[PDB]
Amino acid sequence: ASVYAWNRKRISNCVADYSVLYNSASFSTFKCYGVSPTKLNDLCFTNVYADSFVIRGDEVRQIAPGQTGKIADYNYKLPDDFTGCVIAWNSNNLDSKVGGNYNYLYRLFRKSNLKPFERDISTEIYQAGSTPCNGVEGFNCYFPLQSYGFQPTNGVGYQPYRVVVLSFELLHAPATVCGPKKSTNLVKNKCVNFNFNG
Amino acid sequence: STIEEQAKTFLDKFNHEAEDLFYQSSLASWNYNTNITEENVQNMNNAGDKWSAFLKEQSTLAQMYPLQEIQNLTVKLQLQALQQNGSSVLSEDKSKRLNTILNTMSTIYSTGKVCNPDNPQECLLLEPGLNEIMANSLDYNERLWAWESWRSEVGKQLRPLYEEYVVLKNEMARANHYEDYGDYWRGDYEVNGVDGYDYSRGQLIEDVEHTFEEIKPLYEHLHAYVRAKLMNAYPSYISPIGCLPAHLLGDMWGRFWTNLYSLTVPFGQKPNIDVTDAMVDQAWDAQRIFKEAEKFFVSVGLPNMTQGFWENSMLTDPGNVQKAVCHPTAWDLGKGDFRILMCTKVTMDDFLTAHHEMGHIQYDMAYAAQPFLLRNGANEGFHEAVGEIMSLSAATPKHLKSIGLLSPDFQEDNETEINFLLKQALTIVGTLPFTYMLEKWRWMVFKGEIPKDQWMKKWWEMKREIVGVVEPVPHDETYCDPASLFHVSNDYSFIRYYTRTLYQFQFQEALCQAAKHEGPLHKCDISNSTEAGQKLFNMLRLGKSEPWTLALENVVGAKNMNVRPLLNYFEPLFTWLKDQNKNSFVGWSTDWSPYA
Numbered sequence: 100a101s102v103y104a105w106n107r108k109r110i111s112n113c114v115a116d117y118s119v120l121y122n123s124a125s126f127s128t129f130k131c132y133g134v135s136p137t138k139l140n141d142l143c144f145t146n147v148y149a150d151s152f153v154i155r156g157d158e159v160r161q162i163a164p165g166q167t168g169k170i171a172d173y174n175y176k177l178p179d180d181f182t183g184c185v186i187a188w189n190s191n192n193l194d195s196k197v198g199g200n201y202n203y204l205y206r207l208f209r210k211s212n213l214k215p216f217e218r219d220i221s222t223e224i225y226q227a228g229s230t231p232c233n234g235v236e237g238f239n240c241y242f243p244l245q246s247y248g249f250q251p252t253n254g255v256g257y258q259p260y261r262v263v264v265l266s267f268e269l270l271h272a273p274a275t276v277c278g279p280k281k282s283t284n285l286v287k288n289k290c291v292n293f294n295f296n297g
Numbered sequence: 298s299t300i301e302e303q304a305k306t307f308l309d310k311f312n313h314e315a316e317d318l319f320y321q322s323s324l325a326s327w328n329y330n331t332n333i334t335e336e337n338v339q340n341m342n343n344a345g346d347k348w349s350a351f352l353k354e355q356s357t358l359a360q361m362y363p364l365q366e367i368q369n370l371t372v373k374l375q376l377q378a379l380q381q382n383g384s385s386v387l388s389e390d391k392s393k394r395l396n397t398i399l400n401t402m403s404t405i406y407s408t409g410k411v412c413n414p415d416n417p418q419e420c421l422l423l424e425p426g427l428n429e430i431m432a433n434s435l436d437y438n439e440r441l442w443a444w445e446s447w448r449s450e451v452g453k454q455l456r457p458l459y460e461e462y463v464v465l466k467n468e469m470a471r472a473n474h475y476e477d478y479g480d481y482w483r484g485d486y487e488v489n490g491v492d493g494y495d496y497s498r499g500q501l502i503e504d505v506e507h508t509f510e511e512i513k514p515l516y517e518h519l520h521a522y523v524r525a526k527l528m529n530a531y532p533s534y535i536s537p538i539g540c541l542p543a544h545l546l547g548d549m550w551g552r553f554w555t556n557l558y559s560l561t562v563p564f565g566q567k568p569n570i571d572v573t574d575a576m577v578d579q580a581w582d583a584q585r586i587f588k589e590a591e592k593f594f595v596s597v598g599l600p601n602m603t604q605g606f607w608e609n610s611m612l613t614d615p616g617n618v619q620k621a622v623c624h625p626t627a628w629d630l631g632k633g634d635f636r637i638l639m640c641t642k643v644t645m646d647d648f649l650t651a652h653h654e655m656g657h658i659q660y661d662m663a664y665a666a667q668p669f670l671l672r673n674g675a676n677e678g679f680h681e682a683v684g685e686i687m688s689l690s691a692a693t694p695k696h697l698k699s700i701g702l703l704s705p706d707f708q709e710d711n712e713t714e715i716n717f718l719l720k721q722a723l724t725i726v727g728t729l730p731f732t733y734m735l736e737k738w739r740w741m742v743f744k745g746e747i748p749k750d751q752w753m754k755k756w757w758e759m760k761r762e763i764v765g766v767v768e769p770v771p772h773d774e775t776y777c778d779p780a781s782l783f784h785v786s787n788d789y790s791f792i793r794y795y796t797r798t799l800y801q802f803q804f805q806e807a808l809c810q811a812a813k814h815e816g817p818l819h820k821c822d823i824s825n826s827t828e829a830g831q832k833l834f835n836m837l838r839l840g841k842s843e844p845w846t847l848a849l850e851n852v853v854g855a856k857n858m859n860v861r862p863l864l865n866y867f868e869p870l871f872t873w874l875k876d877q878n879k880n881s882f883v884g885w886s887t888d889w890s891p892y893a
């Protein structure tokens with residue numbers, strides 16, 4: 100999805116294996132805020148929010164708590180007290196075409212900054228001036244959604260990066276997104292410490 | 298809400314749209330330059346027309362925001378850059394006439410072919426047909442024939458065109474609230490609104506004269522030495538008291554004197570520092586040349602080249618089937634795309650040019666964080682100067698020994714330093730009076746100090762007075778002798794080379810003082826010094842966001858262009874030239890004593 104209309108998938112009622120993601124060599128950014136990757140595979144959470152979008156290379160830094168920029172203020176805002184991980188990887192192979200891939204949009208102007216975990220899909224003309232826009236893009240009135248130019252010959256700070264942000268929250272409901280239950284081979288006829296289903 | 302926020306949002310919209318449109322235009326220009334084919338020419342023309350129409354529409358939108366209600370310096374700089382009319386203030390008929398005149402001058406210069414009357418079956422173009430003759434011949438009348446025939450054909454074609462050009466450009470400039478087109482060119486160095494660091498358009502000419510008055514003794518001694526050597530080369534043509542004949546300077550126009558190094562060498566018996574054979578023996582590819590240049594730039598602490606640079610640049614001549622422009626050019630295409638288009642040979646000149654163009658690439662990469670319309674040099678001099686400092690540092694024997702290209706048992710005595718400094722003076726010092734005289738003549742033409750019927754009588758008078766070069770035979774007003782050069786026929790500013798030459802040695806002294814070099818300035822190498830790279834990158838990261846005076850304060854600690862680093866660079870050579878000019882006469886006479 101575009102960063103203005105970022106996809107949110109709620110992940111529930113399954114086992115989340117985080118070691119598969121962490122040990123992959125295909126990801127450029129795996130920055131976790133509020134939790135460490137080593138204990139993710141053990142802990143259990145009520146729900147997982149997976150937000151997916153595409154941004155530029157230079158805009159990956161703005162996907163963090165406390166940051167300022169076009170993406171943070173007008174497209175995707177993260178809370179300061181955020182627990183989760185930001186995973187980003189280069190997608191110049193898929194999201195760039197020789198003619199130029201203009202299928203990715205971003206919101207350029209909004210009157211106020213976004214709240215955390217807010218999606219703005221409004222396509223109303225931004226009013227920067229005293230004059231009424233009247234729905235037409237003229238003078239002091241600009242269309243807020245602008246297309247990204249993705250070419251395969253661009254620099255790494257302008258190449259498209261696919262970003263998936265995982266948000267971990269604990270609510271009073273029973274936590275069902277748990278980490279892998281690791282098992283070992285069964286040994287019989289010896290005095291051992293057994294752990295069977297807790 | 299406020300006017301400043303309106304301008305900031307408009308500038309954001311302009312930056313985001315303009316960067317993609319400029320990338321498309323630049324990619325089309327690249328595809329034309331690496332592949333000269335008619336569809337690439339059509340794509341370039343379409344992209345350029347779209348880019349120019351977009352700039353017209355954005356300037357039209359930009360003018361509705363008045364300048365004096367904005368206090369932020371960067372926003373005011375971008376609005377000042379955008380709100381320039383350009384040719385749009387001129388009428389559509391005169392704008393079309395000016396564009397037609399520029400295009401036909403480009404075709405006349407590019408496709409100008411001149412050969413001897415009564416032998417017309419084949420003819421030679423300027424590059425490389427006439428360049429090789431001017432740079433390598435030792436015959437007086439052959440060079441005289443080539444010079445007079447090319448200025449006859451080119452000047453007699455271009456003189457009415459230039460007479461229309463000066464009037465149209467003056468009309469456009471006075472329609473843009475400038476005094477003349479010379480004031481329009483001098484407005485690149487104009488700084489307004491900064492406390493203390495303001496620079497005026499009228500201060501530029503005074504500073505150029507003030508620096509040239511200190512240039513003049515060194516150039517007089519160099520001219521006397523070159524006159525004595527050319528008297529040895531050509532026995533009877535050159536007078537001891539007069540100026541040099543125009544067609545004997547080693548180039549077509551007198552732009553550089555570097556092709557007279559064979560004739561004017563001090564110590565021919567001593568060896569040269571030529572490293573060409575050493576690269577040929579070790580089979581150094583152009584890829585190895587650029588990797589050694591990258592090693593030089595990582596040694597000083599600057600960032601290394603991108604992956605897209607190595608993937609997308611053309612560092613070798615493609616072949617017979619594919620046509621490309623042979624001139625070395627570094628391209629900042631936009632959106633982090635940096636390329637070098639050079640037909641690199643295994644020579645010292647191509648190696649120094651590779652360092653120069655990778656310096657251009659480093660300069661372009663440094664201000665990538667800046668907004669789009671501020672992605673330039675602080676003036677036109679800095680952009681070339683940061684490449685010329687790399688050309689200075691890479692040419693040193695210490696750099697060649699460090700990278701293994703020179704023998705470690707090469708004896709560095711004073712004679713090799715004298716002849717190397719003389720070669721660098723013939724390249725660098727010799728272009729300064731020609732540049733100053735040409736720009737002062739063009740300024741007086743645009744200002745109206747010189748009437749159209751008196752252009753050449755004054756011009757040769759200027760050339761005898763400043764350059765010390767006499768015409769072979771007198772020229773009337775049917776000739777157009779200045780416009781045979783590339784930059785003047787194609788509407789380019791020429792004071793950038795003068796400012797580049799002075800900024801080159803100012804930056805060289807600043808980085809060598811940063812690197813704590815304890816010897817002569819020409820023996821200095823800026824490799825292995827992180828602090829020199831940091832001092833460079835402090836100015837490099839600014840781009841066009843800050844004034845060039847403040848950038849010069851950031852590098853050298855001075856608020857103005859200075860001439861003393863150049864004189865300090867050539868001071869051993871200056872003493873040697875003063876010793877060698879005891880018998881001969883320093884200075885020239887403006888009379889017709891050699892030949893007319």
Ligand SMILES: *[C@@H]1O[C@H](CO)[C@@H](O)[C@H](O)[C@H]1NC(C)=O
Pocket residue numbers: 332334619
């Ligand atoms: C240059 O152009 C020719 C003909 O237009 C084409 O066949 C060739 O592939 C081009 N070269 C490159 C490197 O694309």
Ligand SMILES: *[C@@H]1O[C@H](CO)[C@@H](O)[C@H](O)[C@H]1NC(C)=O
Pocket residue numbers: 305369370371372
């Ligand atoms: C000027 O504007 C730029 C970007 O619009 C901003 O980063 C900078 O802080 C501003 N400077 C001042 C003095 O307001």
Ligand SMILES: *[C@@H]1O[C@H](CO)[C@@H](O)[C@H](O)[C@H]1NC(C)=O
Pocket residue numbers: 360380381382386473474
């Ligand atoms: C550009 O031309 C228009 C038309 O006359 C004029 O109103 C405007 O002031 C010009 N721009 C500048 C910066 O002078």
Ligand SMILES: *[C@@H]1O[C@H](CO)[C@@H](O)[C@H](O)[C@H]1NC(C)=O
Pocket residue numbers: 601602603604
């Ligand atoms: C440039 O330097 C970085 C860090 O030193 C390195 O990771 C990268 O591979 C270098 N680029 C190239 C093309 O070697």
Ligand SMILES: *[C@@H]1O[C@H](CO)[C@@H](O)[C@H](O)[C@H]1NC(C)=O
Pocket residue numbers: 711712715873
């Ligand atoms: C080089 O130094 C020697 C010894 O000091 C001296 O005799 C000679 O003239 C010098 N040559 C030059 C060109 O300075």
Ligand SMILES: *[C@@H]1O[C@H](CO)[C@@H](O)[C@H](O)[C@H]1NC(C)=O
Pocket residue numbers: 596699824825
């Ligand atoms: C600069 O650093 C490189 C990297 O090791 C080294 O090879 C070179 O010799 C150094 N320069 C000097 C003058 O020692």
